[PDB]
Design a protein around this ligand. Structure first.
Ligand SMILES: [Ca+2]
Length: 223
């Protein structure tokens, strides 16, 4: 997260860290046994870390649970990142408490202007590299599709949406991928991609979760 702030220990209870020997992507807990993340975050041997704040210090509220199954969206396209979403089932149910809680799925799509909360342990620099140990937060508005399309060198589909700032300075970044974009208490987006980080005319692109609720529900009910 570039231009954000320190969230505060466990103030984003649904935020998870995907670990394969080190933190590499974020995710969101949608119920005691399932996590939602980005398909481009797929890797074998994923361990889901819940109740985390500082990912390098055992603070006492963590729960480390390995994945028993990973399901990348059937139509994921690695070249365009269209359908960049993935479901991860935990080997054992997470223990829900005040610091570990699930986030609700959308019943409708969000509209431009709506304020959302984006969080992650990704890079905090737009012109360099500096990874934080504690969770970072950023309030960002959903923007009109035109906002991202105007200067984009890549395809932006109906399964993606634009959020952030056009004058740069604030944006999600590498390491934040797979993380949540929560608006009005619902998980509306998944950190997916962008050209650089917090660059002028180049806001972040997020997977539009409201388009996948049917697939998510059917999949977890059958697995
Ligand atoms: Ca920790």
């Amino acid at each position: 997260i570039v231009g954000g702030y320190t969230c505060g220990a466990n103030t984003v209870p649904y935020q998870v860290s995907l670990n394969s020997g080190y933190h590499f992507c974020g995710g969101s807990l949608i119920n005691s046994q399932w996590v939602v993340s980005a398909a481009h975050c797929y890797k074998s041997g994923i361990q889901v870390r819940l109740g985390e704040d500082n990912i390098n210090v055992v603070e006492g509220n963590e729960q480390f649970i390995s994945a028993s199954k990973s399901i990348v969206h059937p139509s994921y396209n690695s070249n365009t990142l269209n359908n960049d979403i993935m479901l991860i089932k935990l080997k054992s149910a997470a223990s829900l408490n005040s610091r570990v809680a699930s986030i609700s799925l959308p019943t409708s799509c969000a509209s431009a202007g709506t304020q959302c909360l984006i969080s992650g342990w990704g890079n905090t620099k737009s012109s360099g590299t500096s990874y934080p140990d504690v969770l970072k937060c950023l309030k960002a508005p959903i923007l009109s599709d035109s906002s991202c399309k105007s200067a984009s060198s890549f395809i932006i589909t109906s399964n993606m949406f634009c959020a952030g700032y056009l004058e740069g300075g604030k944006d999600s970044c590498q390491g934040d991928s797979g993380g949540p974009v929560v608006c009005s208490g619902k998980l509306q987006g998944i950190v997916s991609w962008g050209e650089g980080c917090a660059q002028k005319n180049k806001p972040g692109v997020y997977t539009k979760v409201c388009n996948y609720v049917s697939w998510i529900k059917q999949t977890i009910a059958s697995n």
